[PDB]
Design a protein around this ligand. Structure first.
Ligand SMILES: COc1ccc(N2CCN(c3cccc(C)c3)CC2)nn1
Lengths: 59, 40, 59, 255, 273, 255, 57, 40
């Protein structure tokens, strides 16, 4: 509800099976993407095309 | 002489002088010769 | 964001499940990053919705 | 002894023979071909089911009677349920295809009547409401049933007025589109080969139809005396050079 | 080039005038296949029927209007025509529209020309000299709200400033998402049960914003903007039947109900001259 | 810095990474390949959907607990409903395929337990009734669910006794079949590549399963103190070099 | 210029998609490292993202 | 053609067409090869 270091953290629960960790659409100019450097630059242009690289680092 | 850098800024294009109506007037698969019977 | 032009969804699920060692507990977190592949193209510059103002600033 | 008249088309595991053809049209004089790399954008390798999708599907038959106004099918819609063509369609994000269309109608040397068989690239229909009323999805996706131009206006459906091609242009000028006539006295089939025509290299098969096939009686059917007053018209269509790309979960579409 | 060759009597087994139109072809028959002709030359190239020529002259595509007046106490500038946008499109006016829709896909650069003239319908001491600013607000950019927003800084968005009475001119490259502009589209933006149908779902090139830069004088001044569009570097594919009925909407093919017969009825018989 | 240990398998539009592998087995030292002409009999050209069928399908997960007896899946059955692989399956008269099987089970350095992962060509099951009672169709076509060897005898179903491999042979000798162990202390996945093994060049995909994949706990799962007493096991399988032939109407199979 | 090369099935000991972000690098991974791709060309130069262009209006 | 004497008076510069993200994307001291293990 207010910007926090915690919205960068995707939590994981021990022992859950089959279940879903997170979900998002890919509107790179809006939503989660919007404040990232990528999101932030994309917004200076009208059209984009290309591949995106999404990585997850485990802690 | 183009005074400008971009291609969109140049004047109108110049005549195709292409002209080939056969894609529209004769798109038949087996060629038809004028003078020969239409249906054999 | 535009419909015709929309790009998909990204989701993540447990494949088997997180398992913590003994003497350990709670949630673990993933950090996630985004960057563009060398593939990428951006065109037709415009103004960003990400910044605006109501009076000129001064010193 | 080859005549323009007799023909055989074998595609996949299915063959068609006509003994009374009138040549065949190849839209814009181009034959269907796969998507070249130089024209490619999506980086995905595509899937080319070949003979399992490139065979002939015969849609259900229509009945030409003296009151018929004409019928309209959209592609790839008409085939949305045919065998593996259809599955591939709902399961990939993008697909591309050309077709061979074979329209059949035989009678006798005492009948008269003449149908126009035409393929219209990007046939955007008009709402009969006027103004800027849209034509809902379901209405432009009739499936194998196609649209029956002598059916009644419905709500959210297109206009079905024949002298206007369902779009504000005159029936008389449809001849600028690849087309062929079936004149009972000459002809008994019409065959058109359709190359893939779009402004993008590959597209969605469900949100956009890229041709409407239209069969329209123009010289009314006239049967011999005390003949039954009607003839069936059958449409058989075969996808050719089909490619699918961006496989996943399987689209869910309205209705 | 010969327009007609010389040809004399014929008594053959080779009849070029009998054909089978059911085939879909238009056989290239000439006067000399059926009468005796003399040589004549063409003297002509077909220059002025080139599609570049046909679509290449400026056509009026839009007339809008804005006014210069005291905005003091105006709660909605947009609504007072303090400034006005133009959700850009070419379907608005019908002259150029019928010309373009002779083709299915079209591709070309645009060279726009903007004429602005002022009117002072009620008592003024004079005619003021106003500068218009025209700023192209592509999709995804902040949209003016007031006639002097931060928006109008237009630090990244191309804008032109010219004087009322004058003309502004600048061309823009072909900014279509695809390889060409669709003149028709028998599709939807997605498989939704209620989403719009047609081109509209592609026409998403933003909108043009106009405003006067001048503050207000004692009288009010009406400025009326006319946008002209000229296609240059034209490429057109797939000819279609010309538009017969009147138009009702930008981007749909719809025609009006109880329209009138478009084919002129004979005053007389089929046999009449 | 390549280890036997880390691996990546990319097949179609899907990729698997393991950081704790124990090499991989290729049945009988042969890698899947298409059907050569010299071996062909049916004259039909076959369909090779390629990347739309040769990708990785992850079946639903199992739960290894201290009481588990083992699970058994049959191929191509287990995949009868996965994406376009499955459609092709029901729609052609004949089909043929090899697979990459990747079984996954991770734990920690305090757990113990060891699973046997084995592929048995032509695993004809036994009826628990004895005599010459048959094993009904449905029972040998469990689909993605597979057979749970610790479930109860059912009527018309197979016997589920583990020391006998469901056929009158001893568990101990299953090691003569291509197999790999998952020993929590070593291993976390098992990967086996299966070439197509049959006495005919191509066969029916619905009346005959050509391998059973079997995962059997052998050294019981032992979790660290006050750990939850169970681990999930996941099976992901990818058809490879698939070919379908004799397309038609679409099989209807019991139940 | 190719935007993507053609690439097919992989079963290797060489995994380009596993990295250690703690190092501070962004490893140059491409679509063709993890799916099967077809050749496609760029058709584009990145002209309008040059800093001269970005700050030049 | 420059009509003016000073360099500041010339038009915009022309595309770097330089482009080398490695100072930003891979400033590591010991080279990392894609495909080889990150940490050995
Ligand atoms: C239906 O065909 C077309 C053909 C051209 C066209 N566009 C409209 C937008 N336009 C444009 C593009 C950039 C900047 C400005 C002011 C206008 C270019 C032409 N729109 N539709």
């Amino acid at each position: 509800t207010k910007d926090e270091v915690n919205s960068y953290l995707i939590p994981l629960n021990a022992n859950r099976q089959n279940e879903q960790v997170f979900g998002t659409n890919l509107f790179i100019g809006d939503g989660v993407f919007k404040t990232t450097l990528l999101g932030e630059i994309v917004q200076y242009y009208t059209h984009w095309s290309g591949s995106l690289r999404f990585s997850l680092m485990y802690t | 002489i183009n005074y400008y850098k971009d291609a969109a800024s140049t004047s109108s294009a110049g005549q195709s002088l292409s002209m080939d109506p056969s894609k529209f007037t004769e798109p038949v698969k087996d060629l038809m010769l004028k003078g020969a019977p239409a249906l054999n | 964001p535009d419909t015709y032009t929309s790009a998909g969804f990204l989701s993540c699920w447990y494949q088997t499940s997180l398992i913590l060692p003994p003497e350990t507990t709670g949630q673990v977190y993933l950090l996630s990053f985004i960057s563009a592949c060398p593939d990428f193209k951006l065109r037709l510059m415009k103004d960003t919705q990400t910044i605006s103002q109501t009076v000129a600033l001064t010193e | 002894g080859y005549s323009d008249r007799v023909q055989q088309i074998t595609l996949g595991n299915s063959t068609i023979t006509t003994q009374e053809a009138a040549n065949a049209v190849v839209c814009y004089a181009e034959w269907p071909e796969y998507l070249p790399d130089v024209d490619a954008s999506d980086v995905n390798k595509t899937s080319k089911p070949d003979t399992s999708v490139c065979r002939f599907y015969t849609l259900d038959s229509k009945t030409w009677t003296t009151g018929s106004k004409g019928w309209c099918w959209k592609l790839p819609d008409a085939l949305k349920d045919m065998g593996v063509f259809g599955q591939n369609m709902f399961f990939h994000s993008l697909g591309r295809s050309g077709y061979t269309v074979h329209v059949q109608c035989n009678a006798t040397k005492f009948h008269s009547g003449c149908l126009l068989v035409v393929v219209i690239p990007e046939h955007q229909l008009a709402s009969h409401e006027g103004g800027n009323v849209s034509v809902k999805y379901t209405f432009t996706h009739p499936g194998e049933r196609g649209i029956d131009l002598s059916s009644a206006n419905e709500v959210g459906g297109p206009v079905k007025d024949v002298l206007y091609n369902m779009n504000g242009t005159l029936l008389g000028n449809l001849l600028i589109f690849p087309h062929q006539f079936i004149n009972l006295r000459t002809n008994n089939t019409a065959t058109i080969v359709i190359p893939y025509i779009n402004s993008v290299p590959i597209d969605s098969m469900t949100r956009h139809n890229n041709v409407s096939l239209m069969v329209i009686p123009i010289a009314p059917l006239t049967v011999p005396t005390g003949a039954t007053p009607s003839l069936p018209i059958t449409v058989t269509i075969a996808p050719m050079c089909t490619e699918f790309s961006g496989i996943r979960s399987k689209s869910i579409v309205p209705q | 080039t010969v327009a007609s060759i010389s040809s004399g009597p014929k008594h053959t087994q080779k009849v070029p005038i009998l054909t089978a139109n059911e085939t879909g072809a238009t056989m290239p028959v000439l006067p000399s296949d059926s009468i005796e002709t003399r040589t004549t030359y063409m003297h002509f190239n077909g220059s002025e029927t080139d599609v570049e020529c046909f679509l290449g002259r400026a056509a009026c595509v839009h007339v809008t209007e804005i006014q210069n007046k005291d905005a003091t106490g105006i709660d909605n500038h947009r609504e007072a025509k303090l400034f006005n946008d133009w959700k850009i499109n070419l379907s608005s006016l019908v002259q150029l529209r019928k010309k373009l829709e002779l083709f299915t896909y079209v591709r070309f650069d645009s060279e726009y020309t903007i004429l602005a003239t002022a009117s002072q319908p009620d008592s003024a001491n004079y005619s003021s000299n106003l500068v218009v600013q025209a700023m192209y607000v592509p999709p995804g950019a902040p949209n003016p709200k007031e006639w002097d927003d931060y928006t109008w800084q237009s630090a990244s968005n191309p804008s032109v400033f010219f004087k009322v009475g004058d003309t502004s001119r600048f061309s823009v490259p072909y900014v279509g998402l695809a390889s060409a502009y669709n003149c028709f589209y028998d599709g939807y933006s997605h498989d939704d049960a209620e989403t719009q149908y047609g081109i509209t779902v592609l026409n998403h090139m933003g909108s043009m914003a106009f405003r006067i830069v001048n503050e207000h004088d004692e009288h009010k001044t009406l400025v009326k903007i006319r946008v002209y569009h000229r296609a240059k570097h034209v490429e057109a594919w797939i000819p279609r039947a010309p538009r017969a009925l009147p138009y009702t909407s930008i981007g749909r093919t719809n025609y009006p109900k109880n329209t009138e017969p478009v084919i002129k009825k004979r005053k007389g018989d089929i046999k009449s001259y």
